[PDB]
Design a protein around this ligand. Structure first.
Ligand SMILES: [Mg+2]
Ligand SMILES: [Mg+2]
Lengths: 119, 182, 181, 119
């Protein structure tokens, strides 16, 4: 019954992660872009959000900044490729719980969510 | 010898993107490899191989400027994703590099003003070299959502320079453009 | 857009990178079919690591050096280059020109020194986290020589402003250690 | 008892293919580079040869040209990445049975060898 938002431009990645948090009985949502995410946040008000940084159009930092305007207590775990030291740092200052560099272990990602997510 | 410091820094920036991309593709492979969806992994790998095939064909038409625009499109800022294919045997389309590049830059710009930003926009461009009547045909099959389709009305009416716009359908979420060059 | 000269070079380069990944996929696909799953994950990890160092090297504000290493295996050489950056990244820009020139020199020597019937491999490591030096460079070569004498010169008269702290060379290996202040 | 030479700079690929033709009871040989290959051809005189085109130092076309001088009846199947239309064409004119674009199916490559290889 816990809500998790998956935000990545890459489709296969949304599918992958979606099929992961369902095995953990989570209520999964997914957006392929900034605006789509910001709506799902407004309406569904998710608990945890897995945000890609490199999304065409509106990047993670920009949407992470906006999600914050909506719900200041938004739990965000950013995911991106190693070598995005800028955004990784910026997202930390903006209030991102932690981050995962692709290609991450389908395992430890599922833990970090169970971790950062209450009951 | 030593290359220009300007170029040297650009290539590093590009490889940087390519790298980021492949890390995602591996993410896909590794991810599904763990979910034990083996059949799916081979599928993906084949998609990657195909993608690459067209990447090289495009790089072998002696049309560098166009190739470069397409190859780096997704790394620059846009509100739609570009996918491309080259249908037919390679050809020395060099005589059209500058023309095509400029044309696509124009179209891409129009789509940017036309597409919506809440929607997931995708554009596929195909280069046909194998056509019997035309020296080369260009297909643009877009699909997403528009916010201002009007952006095209102009080009739709007055065509464009010396290119032949054989078709230019635009529905509610799709758009199909067909351009011939000879 | 940009200059037609550059535009063509970048396409040539991506061309190589592409060829490489097609081989890496060959490895994954190949072993994926042989059903050596555990092996696949292993390779994928290696790829991820190689990538990590590729990025760190690209973040030391040392473009010219990074470009030389990044494109080394695409140019013609009688040894394969592998490299790592040990330690947090730093703005080694003050050394870009120096290092680049230095490595170009060394690489050239190895070219005339290594045998061609042998499988030569050279690993270069850049250490930024050293306490005494601003930056150390390790070259750990392994293969076979045809003319180790090529190094005699540099080995005796050192090299300009760089400190060659170590330069062992056995029958099939070679270990160079260089410090920079 | 049939001799097959694997020539690729890429180690893992040598290992892969080697562990393939052994399951088929073939006598496998492998070289990392041109010269090493030319020697194994001189001495061992292999039946079939799997030659990679992009090898540092001495490329396939060059070694395939040399293997011919030694044994004109040398069976050579080149393998490389798509987009090497030049060498693929050259090799065909020089006497290459066929070819395979990486990443090829570990299966069809094994047939092509059983095919092009007598008994
Ligand atoms: Mg992405
Ligand atoms: Mg090779």
């Amino acid at each position: 019954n816990e809500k998790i938002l998956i935000v990545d431009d890459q489709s296969g990645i949304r599918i992958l992660l979606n099929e992961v948090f369902n095995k953990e009985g989570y209520q999964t949502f997914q957006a392929a872009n900034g605006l789509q995410a910001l709506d799902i946040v407004t309406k569904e008000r998710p608990d945890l959000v897995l945000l890609d940084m490199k999304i065409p159009g509106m990047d993670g930092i920009e949407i992470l900044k906006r999600m914050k305007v909506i719900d200041e207590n938004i739990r965000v775990i950013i995911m991106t490729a190693y070598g995005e030291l800028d955004m990784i740092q910026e997202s930390k200052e903006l209030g991102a719980l932690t981050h995962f560099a692709k290609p991450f272990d389908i395992d430890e990602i599922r833990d970090a969510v169970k971790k950062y997510l209450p009951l | 010898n030593i290359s220009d410091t300007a170029l040297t820094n650009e290539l590093i920036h590009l490889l940087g993107h390519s790298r980021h991309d492949w890390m995602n593709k591996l993410q896909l492979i590794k991810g599904n490899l763990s979910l034990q969806k083996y059949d799916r992994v081979f599928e993906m790998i084949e998609e990657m191989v195909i993608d690459a095939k067209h990447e090289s064909k495009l790089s072998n038409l002696k049309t560098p400027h166009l190739a470069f625009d397409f190859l780096t499109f997704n790394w620059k800022t846009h509100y739609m994703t570009l996918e491309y294919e080259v249908l037919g045997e390679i050809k020395d389309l060099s005589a059209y590099d500058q023309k095509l590049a400029k044309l696509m830059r124009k179209l891409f710009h129009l789509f940017d003003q036309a597409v919506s930003r809440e929607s997931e926009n995708h554009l596929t461009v195909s280069l046909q070299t194998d056509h019997p009547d035309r020296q080369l045909i260009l297909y643009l099959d877009f699909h997403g959502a528009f916010a201002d389709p009007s952006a095209f009305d102009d080009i739709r009416q007055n065509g464009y320079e010396d290119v032949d716009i054989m078709r230019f359908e635009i529905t509610s979420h799709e758009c199909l453009i067909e351009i011939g060059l000879d």
